[PDB]
Amino acid sequence: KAKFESEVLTRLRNMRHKIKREDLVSIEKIIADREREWERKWEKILGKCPFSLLK
Amino acid sequence: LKTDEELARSFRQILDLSFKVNKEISLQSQKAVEETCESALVRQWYFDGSLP
Amino acid sequence: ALMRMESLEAEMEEVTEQILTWREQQKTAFQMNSDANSSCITAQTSYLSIENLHP
Amino acid sequence: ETSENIVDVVRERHQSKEKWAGSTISTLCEKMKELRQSYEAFQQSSLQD
Amino acid sequence: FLRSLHDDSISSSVHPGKEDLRSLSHQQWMSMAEKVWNTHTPNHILAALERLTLNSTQELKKLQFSQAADLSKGPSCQLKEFSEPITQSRSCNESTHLDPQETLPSFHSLIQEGWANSVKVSSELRRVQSQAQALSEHLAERIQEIHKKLSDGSEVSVLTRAAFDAELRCVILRGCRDALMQECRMLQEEAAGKKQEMKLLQQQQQNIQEACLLLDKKQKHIQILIKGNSSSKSQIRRSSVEAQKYVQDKLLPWPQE
Amino acid sequence: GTTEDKCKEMMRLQLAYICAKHKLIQMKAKSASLKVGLQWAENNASVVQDKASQKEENLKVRITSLKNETLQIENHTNSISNEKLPGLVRDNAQLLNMPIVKGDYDLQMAHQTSCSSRQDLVCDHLMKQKASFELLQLGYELELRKHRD
Helix, strand or coil: CHHHHHHHHHHHHHHHHHHHHHHHHHHHHHHHHHHHHHHHHHHHHHCCCHHHHCC | CHHHHHHHHHHHHHHHHHHHHHHHHHHHHHHHHHHHCCHHHHHHHHHCCCCC | CHHHHHHHHHHHHHHHHHHHHHHHHHHHHHHHHHHHHHHHHHHHHHHHHHHHCCC | CHHHHHHHHHHHHHHCEECCCCCCCEEHHHHHHHHHHHHHHHHHHHHCC | CHHHHHHHHHCCCCCCCCCHHHHHHHHHHHHHHHHHHHHCCHHHHHHHHHHHHHHHHHHHHHHHHHHHHHHCCCCCCCCCCCCCCCCCCCCCCCCCCCCCCCCCCCHHHHHHHHHHHHHHHHHHHHHHHHHHHHHHHHHHHHHHHHHHHCCCCCHHHHHHHHHHHHHHHHHHHHHHHHHHHHHHHHHHHHHHHHHHHHHHHHHHHHHHHHHHHHHHHHHHHHHHHHHHHHHHHHHHHHHHHHHHHHHHHHHCCCCCC | CCHHHHHHHHHHHHHHHHHHHHHHHHHHHHHHHHHHHHHHHHHHCCCCCCHHHCCHHHHHHHHHHHHHHHHHHHHHHHHHHHHHHHHHHHHHHHHHHHHHHHHHHHHHHHHHHHHHHHHHHHHHHHHHHHHHHHHHHHHHHHHHHHHHC
């Protein structure tokens, strides 16, 4: 029983580490690139920061 | 006891995952729509009324 | 009690897989639409040409 | 002693209500179910495409 | 008396009738104060003041310790059921139903919900886009069938075809307009439904500003009191020196004369 | 993040919503128009053979009339799509921020109470100190009067 539960704990930790170090890092990079590409695109078209117009 | 604590932590991370995924999908969808529309039209969507 | 705790862990793994599967499905869906829009720009020009029946 | 402690820890985890996401208070099992239903709904809407 | 002056300064409602009551209250204090100075010895009165000052410092320390604990007190702690009803003691203010104080949601948690809702809209868009493509294909098939039946090469058949296409275009465009109006109605209803909520937020916003201004007033007053108490301390020292100087310069020389 | 970062995030959320909602409504309108077109095409498919017996002069007048009606409807549709619709969507998009703002307000209000409560405590304490100083000051004035007698 102690050995089995230990395996369960290791599986949960591996899952969390996979989510935090692999999955979220990849997703956050894609989000940041997309937000920058977007801000550059509209800054070029509007000659000003797009967010100033919405304030 | 350690397994119990890890359950709560692991679940918060799953929620963070869900959030970032939803945001990703929403930005991609925005980009797809902007590419199908003329920039002048979209500009009217976002900003028309705020431009002198 | 230990069986119940194991059930929660299984459910967490399942939901995590569901979120990641959903993410992959959406990535494919946006790639297919970008390829189809490139093809369809060609076909739509054709039919509105029936307004040109002058002589 | 150990057998009794383990039963209590697991019971507390199943019954405890916390703000996990948003403005609503729920148990871990409820919030997890909600999240599962939401992605099932999302997947069903994509297969009908 | 001082507190009453303080409350009146914060509540801008300069009620014009409250001055005569103030004077009476000052006089009453003077008389009482004088009686105290005549009934008790100055050393006793000073000792009493020292003791009263010890109590104030003690209370301040107690509040800090409790208040600081509150800052360091964040919710894991379980509702221990302790029993005994004595009297009531509902709250120091008098009552305390409120503590729903469930951990107010964090920006992060709310914004997360916002993005989840945005995805619901994007998902709906995809669904409707697929439906519009099916319908467009179905309509093209039907138009082709109708055109094949009017192909008997007669000038009247060509004109009949053109008339069909024109009637069809009109029906489609009417349908689009009606749909857009319908959608605009929905968006208006939704915005109208939330207009009350927005009013409420505006009121809250006003309240926050007012209460921000209220906090500014309490701070400006705290500044004035602090400055005022520092000046009084200097004045007491000056008065003590003046009384001693009078005894030395004017009274002590009389026995020799 | 700085209030500024949060604002930016909120705005991003709005912009994403505007883009998606606008396209959604356009697609809903297209879909509805196609549906009505399809229904009409299906109902008038059998009548088109009987109209071919009409005098050429009547069909020409009808086509011209229909062309003029189509232009009017198109101009109305474009007006709704380009002027009324984008404004309404934007207004709705701003409403997305309501729960977040509310949440913040609530948080601020709650914060305001703590500072104000301590402010009142300090003010009353500072006032208790002043009351004690004024009593001592009066004590010196009375003593000076007795020395003069």
